[PDB]
Design a protein around this nucleic acid. Structure first.
Lengths: 99, 315, 98, 75, 1334
DNA sequence: ACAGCATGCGCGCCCAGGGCTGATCGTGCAAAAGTCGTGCCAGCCGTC
DNA sequence: GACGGCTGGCACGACTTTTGCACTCGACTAAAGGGGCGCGCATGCTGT
């Protein structure tokens, strides 16, 4: 952890029961800012209709959503993904749609 | 993810737009004709005759259907597929580098001949350089238009069944996976291992297999042998297709392949052929007769032209 | 979390169990004892059925909120009739009297 | 005008249950429509306007009954 | 489609099933899988249940459904009700009437019993072979007999023609069809009068009540076997959760098509004239088929399936989960709540909460859609959404007007009482956390460690008013279980107001006059101190002394700057002397209390808010901190330690001499270190004086120190001197998980480091203390479920019923000092009859009134020791409480209104206290260990004493002892009210003679438990007795005899020259004298002695009415009890004598103590003691009043140990709920010797005295039990079992035909409706008058 | 003539033991259904 | 513009495969049917 200057006094009810007050300079100084790391994994399988392929085309998706995807459908290292965006797609076949 | 789809969500969208009486009735009469593609309203005369007269003319239902076509997944229902394209172009941007006009020229008419190739049509639309190619890029960037439902999160994996391994120039069964249960599985892992020994996938297709041979080997009933392989799918190192290597024929010839290599290699021989548009079934039957398969040319033409084959309509 | 309306489930037509997948938290019989301790009536009525286990009540109530009606359209939805049918399967009868 | 305590409006006819239902059916008229408030509006919702009409004594069960008889007689 | 008032369940008829729905299926053809189109006949398909989708059908006619009530071709036309799928079911037609499995018998099983014949016979003839003979006569055999294939062949051979026997139940339908119910019931009553057999009683009562149930129910018993069988809607069948569900794979579907198949086979074979064994095998296997339909069993294992499904089908699948469960009942999702962490802030007046803006936008999202579509900026709802996630600055401007006056609900995970949830007005705040108002840490009970909180949003319309009326916190300033003001200021407020009103001496400036006083302006201008001096100031003060007016005045008074500045906050006329003293938490709670009493609610809520503001403000500018120099080390403590061990080293030396054991040394050590703890504590209290002082010299204590520790501990804000004793001074003793205190305490404190042995031993206490919280919290939260389970059914009904008889209210106090006066007990409620002054003819109240502070002051300044008060129980009112006796309406005030729910606050109010007591009952004995020397019975305060329940015994000394079992002592306060009331030990030796009284001093009793009086009251030798072996082995001067294994009492010897009073048996006795030895009065003849309420597990025994170990017998009227009078050769102490008829006799098997030695003829109500009294004998003899004060006074005596207060109202309500299910002594209209309801008994007595007949119905005996059998005694079958089996409940309700009547809670909760409690209850009334209008 | 204790008998409860269902498992076969081959008929084209 | 040849589509027949009955066939579960043990109690011989 990190030690800081601590003052003992009730101030405007800001410290009530077990609560605590901190300054803005603590936020400005990056003090005890935390970093996290997660993982997402995609799986490719072989179904009864044959094997699965990966990206290189997608229906019903605009170009703005696929602009951040490199060829083969992998994201650029260092790109910023926010919310419901797409990382690495895939495809599963159907049949008898060509009549 | 256990969610409502199709006319449940679409009808739920219809209930939001206020419809006093008639707009709601004819609206519910429209929403039931939507298909998985979504742009098929079939015959409008059926929707008009289904009302059972009492006014409600065609002009009143036309604006209602046009209101159905404006829902969330852009183009909906309408007809001829040339309508929903106009709605896709109208609500897309409304400010474009001359894409709107040329979009109405291409979407209006002449699009039938412009899909295969441009050629002389490039002089018809007067466009030139990268304007026409960029417009075709826009047409390629449009869209089936709907099909936004589904929401198919999961795939139902085959999970294999029994397994095999190739040793020193030979493939043998192993039935790898996972006392009456151990022996019960040992029977299938046994007859399946001998069936994998007699049949090798080997090279190019598979050796013809007759249920009478596998039934004669262990003296097991062929009904029980092929009955289990029908539901279950044996998963080998390549492929998925267990009952396909069980049901066959005697090929009706001494010099030979079975229906598996007959139809398989028939479509393979028809794959590379017709330098332009030969579409000759008698020539393919002669090529099959040159290999000694004893083809009557009646079964080769009818059986070869089936299963997604373009024949004989390729002419 | 602070959900509002997410996707639902086919079984019992109830929202999903937990957050991120948008859970609908929990409402216990102890809080029922609290509202009953207040003598609360319409609030208990909406928390138990229309807002929780009622299917078409989300559509009618939702259309009442969008249009600004703010009316419950009182009555007994869903489980009462299903109970009439499940009991009616048995050889004993249920009626309606005043 | 915010109402901190409802007891002053309940003191008219004491129940503390009836104010919610009577003020509710009074809030149905101005809520849905086809009616006008008898008190000048502060731009606040009709929810408090109900309690303020109960506090002014202009609206009660008997008044809504007489107005109901007037609406039935005028129809 | 309309409100549900009530329904009785009746047995359906085949004509009723043909009435409800209609369908015909001759073939098991459902749907062709290559088509997916309606098909002819079949079930589970679209052929029945009307249209398949919306309203339409494929027939070729009747497609528009212009006609109804018939079938077309492949699609049922009849709807006649509504909906689409779930609509009218249809049915199938069986050829031979059959099936049910669990129809006649519910295991058990009333049918097959009512008819009169064993169940094995019917179960045997329905299956297998055996036939029932019918159309008998002309021979000795009867139709009640059963036959077998051999007896069938020999029967048709010998008996010949007119002999009919059938396999199916058609023979049972005819035999039951020929039964006459009225004449049979008359014969069962005529046989009921003659037969005295107890086993015959219950059977005849059951049969009679059954037959009657068929009489008034109107249901034919032959309807039990149904010909027409309806089928259920297919889609209502819940699909298996595993993998995907399929309607064709349904467990019952295979059974349905199986019954259809066996039905077609049955029709084909009956139309084919098949052999008898064949078609009869078809009938039996059809019976087994429907056996498989409804149940999985009772025929054996009938289960079928692909995976062999277990069968939780129709039997177990009704409303799912083996009963009525799914509706309500916990885990349903809330749909529009949220959760977040709470943060405190010095704003948000009492109704408001900080709501993060990110959380507010999603909850009010639909209102956002509505007002965006309303105010005119919008196109479509989806584009409105687009505006929602694009978050324009105008959207928040919309939301500001959205929230406004529409508050929100707050919920914790636990709710221990009503106030646990409250509503507040949201105020948008930047953050990820929710802000809550500081003033209440109590109702929520949780401080802020980062706990997570739930937020529920009701909408509706009237839910807004319901939120702003009975919920918002500003409406309830009081607790429903007490009436003492909640939301008492604390923490920084107490420190700020204590530092604010404080007085100072000799500072800069003084001796000046300020008006108003106007001094506050200076305080910010310095040149003055807020705590410096007292200065003449002119203050204006209002008052209410003039009725409806305010009398003012302005005076010159002395006060401190802070006090006069705080006087601005006083709202117009509170007295000035309340702020004229140093304000602690006490004076703060009294300030808000007197402010709420005098000025009401609205003044004291904003008053409390402003006291909060100035409290955190001046507490903010106070600037108090802690430090190492604040804690002082006593200089005499080093001596107190040195004095302690110097004594211990002496006592330990005694252990080297062998004169002192380990126990005496132990107690001496504990006493030495305890006295040392007291001495170092006083040295600490004297040390904390004169530390941080204002500038001054001399004086004495120099303006008592301003240091933080004395302000915190002395002011009572947060800490206290108890922990200061651990901070400064010694540590005292420690708690080892053994039960023996260590002899080497910790002599140090936190000023210096502790030794590894001190900190090592100090851990055992915490280790033994950490595991109690959750373990006791389990049961502490478990009792509330059962309390609500018993208490939920009571509701408010009437306004004032009126009555005369009631509960006599007299002040009672615990031992030693006075506990509660008559005020708190008589406060509120209702006073029955009149209460006279000490003078005659003068009445305090004309009839009755609700007692408030004024009338209580009239009772205080006058003398009344007995106040007649009404209550529950008494003033009994049909279907609930009269809502008069229950008044004083805690946490409010008014005459109590109608519609509230009673027992929900009574349950949560009793079960709300957490954990348990400090000690466990009397068994641990922590106050006194065994008996040191004597019990020390004496009085203290002035006034005369009056001996209650005493019996004089002649002694030679001037003092007279008492042999009575129970003895009380009365003291004089003013008119003779109880001051010190303590229980005198049984048979105490009085140092003061009887008939003599004295006020103060002069100890009147001496009691040691080595003795108990048996003495000769007259001089002369002991009565001659025989000494024989076998009676001398008894356990506590040779002993002679003992009445236990058989001190037997004999005639007293009145002379020393001749051998010639009555002695009670203690149960264990040893004779201390020899026969023929001279003894005198007042001298020892034989002297030697021989549940326990409190604790929560004992409270569960108080409500549950457990039976004690040693019961206490009670005495009735007449009888003769002296010295085992009328005692038989065996089983001593049995009372023979008639004594005025009433042959009262009690059987005591000679090993138990004797009732009394005197009194001769006694009466009902006399207390013979003999151990803890059982509530059954008290209710049977004393009455309902002694049971009421029994349970109430005991439970109160349990809760008074922790200082928590609970009013008697709730406990009395529970006692009233335990008085249900009482039995009648004599026959009524038609019934004998069974259980009944008190309400029905009272109504039938009202009909008894109503018109003509002298006696219809008779006296009854009240029964109690509780908490278990009373909860299962509910007369409503819908709420009867939420736990027990559903089948037997539906069978009892099916055959009996009892009405719902819907009075209760879980009734309208589980079935569902607007509940008949609260506002909704008024709704239920508001319709009835309309229904009464036409 | 009444009371005690010993004996005999009836019934409740726990333990042990057998027996249908369950776990499969088999599949023979006559026939019914699915599929492939095969011949026939109608539609399309070229040149005489 | 009429006709015969080519070819594709379709209905029918034959081949192959696989489903309801029909009689199996030997190594479990735990729930229910039977029996023994023990206990309660009623009857009666007897000693007081």
């Amino acid at each position: 952890g990190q030690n800081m200057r601590v003052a003992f006094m009730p101030w405007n009810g800001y410290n009530f029961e077990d609560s605590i007050l901190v300054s803005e300079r603590v936020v400005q100084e990056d003090r005890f800012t935390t970093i996290h790391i997660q993982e997402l994994a995609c799986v490719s399988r072989d179904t009864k209709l044959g094997p699965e392929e990966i990206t290189a085309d997608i229906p019903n998706v605009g170009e703005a959503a696929l602009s951040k995807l490199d060829e083969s459908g992998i994201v650029y290292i260092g790109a910023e993904v926010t919310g419901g965006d797409i990382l690495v797609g895939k495809v599963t076949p159907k049949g008898e749609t060509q009549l | 993810e256990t969610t409502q789809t199709l006319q449940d969500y679409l009808m739920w969208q219809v209930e939001l737009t206020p419809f006093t009486d008639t707009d709601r009735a004819i609206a519910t009469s429209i929403v039931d004709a939507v298909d998985d593609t979504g742009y098929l309203t079939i015959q409008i005369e059926d929707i008009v005759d289904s009302i059972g007269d009492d006014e409600i003319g065609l002009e009143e239902v036309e604006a209602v259907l046009k209101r159905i076509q404006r829902f969330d997944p852009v183009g909906v229902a309408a007809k001829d597929l040339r309508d929903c394209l106009l709605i896709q172009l109208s609500q897309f941007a409304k400010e474009t580098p001359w894409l709107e006009e040329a979009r109405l020229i291409i979407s209006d008419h002449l699009d039938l001949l412009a899909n295969h190739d441009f050629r002389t049509l490039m002089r018809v639309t007067r466009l030139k350089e990268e304007v026409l190619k960029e417009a075709v890029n826009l047409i390629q960037s449009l869209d089936x238009x709907x099909x936004x439902x589904x929401x198919x999160x999961x795939x139902x994996x085959x999970x294999x069944x029994x397994x095999x391994x190739x040793x020193x120039x030979x493939x043998x069964x192993x039935x790898x996976x996972x006392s009456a249960n151990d022996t019960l599985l040992r029977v299938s892992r046994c007859i399946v291992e001998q069936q994998q020994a007699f049949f090798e996938q080997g090279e190019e297709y598979m050796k013809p297999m007759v249920l009478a041979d596998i039934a004669q080997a262990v003296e097991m009933h062929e009904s029980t042998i092929s009955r289990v392989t029908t539901q279950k799918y044996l998963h080998s190192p390549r492929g998925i297709x267990x009952x396909x290597x069980x049901x066959x024929x005697x090929x009706x010839x001494x010099x030979x392949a079975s229906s598996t290599a007959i139809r398989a290699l028939v479509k393979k021989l028809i794959a590379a052929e017709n330098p332009a548009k030969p579409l000759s079934d008698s020539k393919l039957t002669s090529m099959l007769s040159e290999q000694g398969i004893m083809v009557a040319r009646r079964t080769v033409a009818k059986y070869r032209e089936s299963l997604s084959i373009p024949p004989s309509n390729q002419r | 979390h602070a959900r509002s309306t997410g996707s639902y489930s086919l079984v019992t037509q109830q929202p999903l169990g937990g957050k991120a997948q948008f859970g609908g938290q929990r409402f216990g019989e102890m809080e029922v004892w609290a509202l009953e301790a207040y003598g609360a009536a319409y609030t208990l009525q909406e928390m138990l059925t229309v807002k929780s286990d009622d299917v078409n009540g989300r559509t009618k109530m939702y259309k009442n909120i969008v249009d600004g009606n703010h009316q419950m359209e009182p009555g007994m939805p869903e489980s009462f009739n299903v109970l009439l049918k499940e009991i009616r399967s048995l050889g004993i009868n249920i009626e309606l009297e005043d | 005008m915010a109402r901190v305590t409802v007891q002053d409006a309940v003191e008219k006819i004491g129940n503390r249950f009836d104010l919610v239902l009577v003020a509710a059916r009074r809030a149905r008229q101005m809520q849905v429509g086809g009616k006008d408030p008898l008190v000048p509006e502060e731009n606040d919702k009709t929810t408090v306007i109900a309690l303020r009409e109960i506090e002014e004594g202009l609206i009660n069960n008997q008044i809504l009954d007489v107005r109901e008889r007037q609406e039935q007689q005028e129809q | 489609t309309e409100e549900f008032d009530a329904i009785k369940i009746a047995l359906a008829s085949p004509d009723m099933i043909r009435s409800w729905s209609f369908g015909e299926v001759k073939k098991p053809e459902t749907i062709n899988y290559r088509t997916f189109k309606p098909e002819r006949d079949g079930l589970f398909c679209a052929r029945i249940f009307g249209p398949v989708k919306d309203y339409e059908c494929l027939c070729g006619k009747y497609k528009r459904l212009k006609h109804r009530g018939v079938i077309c071709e492949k699609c049922g036309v009849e709807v006649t009700q509504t909906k689409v799928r779930r609509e009218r079911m249809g049915h199938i037609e069986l050829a031979s009437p059959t099936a049910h499995i669990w129809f006649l018998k519910s295991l058990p099983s009333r049918i097959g019993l009512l008819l009169d014949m064993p169940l094995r016979d019917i179960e045997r003839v329905l299956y297998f072979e055996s036939y029932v003979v019918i159309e008998g006569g002309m021979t000795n055999l009867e139709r009640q007999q059963i036959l077998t294939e051999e007896q069938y062949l020999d029967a048709l051979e010998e008996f010949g023609d007119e002999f009919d026997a059938k396999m199916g139940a058609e023979a049972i339908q005819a035999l039951l069809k020929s039964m006459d119910l009225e004449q049979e019931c008359e014969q069962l009553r005529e046989e009921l009068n003659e037969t005295n057999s107890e086993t015959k009683r219950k059977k005849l009562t059951k049969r009679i009540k059954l037959l009657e149930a068929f009489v008034q129910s109107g249901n034919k018993p032959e309807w039990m076997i149904l010909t027409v069988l309806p089928v259920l809607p297919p889609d209502l069948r819940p699909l298996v959760p595993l993998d995907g569900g399929r309607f064709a794979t349904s467990d019952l579907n295979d059974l349905y098509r199986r019954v259809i198949n066996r039905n077609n086979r049955l029709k084909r074979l009956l139309d084919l004239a098949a052999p008898d064994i064949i078609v009869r095998n078809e009938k039996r296997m059809l019976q087994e088929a429907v056996d498989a339909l409804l149940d999985n069993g009772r025929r054996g294992r009938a289960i079928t399936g692909s995976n062999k499904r277990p069968l939780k089908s129709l039997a177990d699948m009704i409303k799912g989960k083996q009963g009525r469960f799914r509706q309500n009942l916990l885990g349903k999702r809330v749909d529009y709540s949220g959760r977040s962490v709470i943060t405190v802030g010095p704003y948000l007046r009492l109704h408001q909460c900080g709501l993060p803006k990110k959380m507010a936008l999603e909850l009010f999202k639909p209102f956002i859609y509505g007002k965006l579509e309303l105010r005119g900026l919008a196109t479509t709802i989806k584009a409105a959404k687009k505006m929602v996630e694009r978050e324009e600055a105008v959207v928040w401007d919309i939301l500001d007007e959205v929230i406004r006056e529409h508050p929100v609900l707050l919920n914790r995970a636990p709710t221990l009482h009503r106030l646990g949830i409250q509503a507040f007005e949201p105020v948008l705040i930047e953050g990820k956390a929710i802000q809550l108002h500081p003033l209440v840490c109590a109702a929520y009970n949780a401080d802020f460690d980062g706990d997570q909180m739930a937020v529920h949003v009701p909408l509706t319309l009237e839910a807004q008013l319901e939120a702003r009326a009975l919920m918002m916190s500003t409406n309830n300033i009081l607790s429903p279980a007490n009436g003492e003001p909640i939301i008492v200021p604390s923490q920084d407020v107490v420190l700020g107001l204590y530092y604010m009103t404080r007085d100072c001496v000799n500072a800069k400036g003084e001796g000046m006059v300020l008006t108003g006083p106007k001094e506050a302006e200076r305080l910010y201008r310095s040149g003055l101190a807020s705590l410096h001096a007292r200065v003449k100031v002119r203050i204006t003060e209002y008052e209410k002394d003039a009725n409806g007016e305010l009398v003012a005045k302005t005076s010159l008074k002395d006060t401190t700057v802070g006090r006069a500045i705080l006087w601005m906050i006083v709202p117009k006329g509170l007295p000035y002397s309340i702020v004229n003293q140093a304000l602690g938490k006490k004076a703060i709670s009294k300030m808000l209390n007197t402010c709420y009493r005098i000025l009401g609610l609205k003044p004291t809520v904003i008053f409390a808010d402003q006291i909060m503001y100035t409290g955190f403000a001046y507490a903010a500018r106070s600037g108090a901190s802690v430090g190492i120099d604040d804690m002082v080390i006593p200089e005499k403590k080093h001596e107190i330690i040195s004095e302690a061990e110097a004594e211990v080293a002496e006592i330990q030396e005694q252990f080297q001499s062998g004169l002192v054991t380990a126990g005496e040394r132990y107690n001496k050590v504990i006493d030495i270190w305890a006295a040392a703890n007291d001495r170092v504590s006083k040295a600490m209290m004297d040390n904390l004086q004169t530390e941080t002082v204002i500038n001054r010299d001399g004086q004495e204590e120099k303006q008592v120190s301003f240091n933080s520790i004395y302000m915190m501990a002395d002011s009572g804000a947060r800490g206290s001197a108890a922990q200061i004793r651990q901070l400064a001074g010694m540590r005292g003793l420690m708690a080892k998980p053994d039960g023996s205190i260590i002899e080497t305490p910790i002599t140090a404190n936190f000023r210096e480091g502790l030794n590894v042995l001190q900190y090592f031993i100090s851990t055992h206490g915490a280790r033994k203390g950490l595991a109690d919280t959750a373990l006791k919290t389990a049961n502490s939260g478990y009792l509330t479920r059962r309390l609500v389970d018993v208490a939920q059914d009571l509701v408010v009904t009437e306004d004032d019923c009126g009555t005369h008889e009631g509960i006599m209210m007299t002040p009672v106090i615990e031992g030693g000092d006075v506990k509660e006066p008559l005020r708190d007990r008589v406060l509120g409620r209702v006073t029955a009859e009149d209460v006279l002054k000490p003078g005659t003819a003068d009445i305090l109240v004309p009839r009755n009134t609700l007692l408030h502070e004024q009338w209580c002051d009239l009772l205080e300044e006058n003398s009344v020791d007995a106040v007649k008060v009404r209550s529950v129980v008494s003033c009994d009112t049909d279907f609930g409480v009269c809502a008069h006796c229950y008044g004083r309406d805690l946490a409010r005030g008014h005459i109590i209104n109608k519609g509230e729910a009673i027992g929900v606050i009574a349950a949560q109010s009793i079960g709300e206290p957490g954990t348990q007591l400090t000690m466990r009952t009397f068994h641990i004995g922590g106050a006194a260990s065994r008996a040191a020397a004597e019990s020390s019975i004496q009085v203290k305060n002035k006034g005369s004493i009056k001996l209650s329940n005493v019996k004089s015994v002649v002694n030679s000394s001037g003092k007279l002892v008492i042999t009575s079992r129970n003895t009380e002592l009365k003291l004089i306060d003013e008119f003779g009210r109880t001051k010190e009331s303590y229980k005198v030990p049984y048979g105490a030796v009085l140092a003061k003679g009887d008939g003599e009284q004295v006020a103060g001093g002069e100890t009147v009793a001496n009691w040691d438990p080595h003795t108990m009086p048996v003495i000769t009251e007259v001089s002369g030798f002991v009565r001659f007795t025989d000494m024989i072996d076998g009676q001398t082995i008894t356990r506590q001067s040779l002993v002679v005899l003992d009445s236990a294994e058989r001190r037997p009492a004999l005639k007293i010897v009145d002379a020393q020259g001749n051998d010639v009073a009555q002695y009670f048996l203690p149960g264990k006795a040893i004779v201390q004298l020899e026969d023929g030895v001279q003894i005198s009065s007042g001298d020892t003849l034989a002297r030697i002695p021989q549940d326990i309420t409190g604790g929560l597990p004992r409270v569960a025994d108080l409500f549950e009415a457990r039976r004690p170990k040693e019961p206490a017998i009670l005495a009735e009227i007449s009888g003769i009890v002296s010295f085992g009078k009328e005692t038989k050769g065996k089983r001593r102490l049995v009372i023979t004598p008639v004594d005025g008829s009433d042959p009262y006799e009690e059987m005591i098997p000679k090993w138990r103590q004797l009732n009394v030695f005197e009194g001769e003829r006694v009466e009902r109500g006399d207390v013979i003691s003999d151990g803890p009294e059982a509530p059954h004998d008290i209710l049977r003899l004393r009455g309902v009043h002694a049971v009421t004060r029994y349970i109430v006074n005991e439970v109160q005596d349990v809760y008074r140990l922790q200082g928590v207060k609970i009013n008697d109202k709730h406990i009395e309500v529970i006692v009233r709920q335990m008085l249900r299910k009482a039995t009648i002594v004599n026959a009524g209209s038609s019934d004998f010797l069974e259980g009944e309801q008190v309400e029905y008994s009272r109504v039938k007595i009202a009909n008894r005295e109503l018109e003509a007949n002298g006696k219809v119905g008779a006296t009854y005996s009240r029964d109690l039990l509780g908490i278990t059998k009373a909860s299962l005694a509910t007369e409503s079958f819908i709420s009867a079992a939420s736990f027990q089996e559903t089948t037997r409940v539906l069978t009892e309700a099916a055959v009996a035909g009892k009405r719902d009547e819907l009075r209760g809670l879980k009734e309208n909760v589980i079935v569902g409706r607007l509940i008949p409690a609260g506002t909704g209850y008024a709704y239920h009334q508001d319709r009835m008058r309309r229904r009464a209008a036409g």
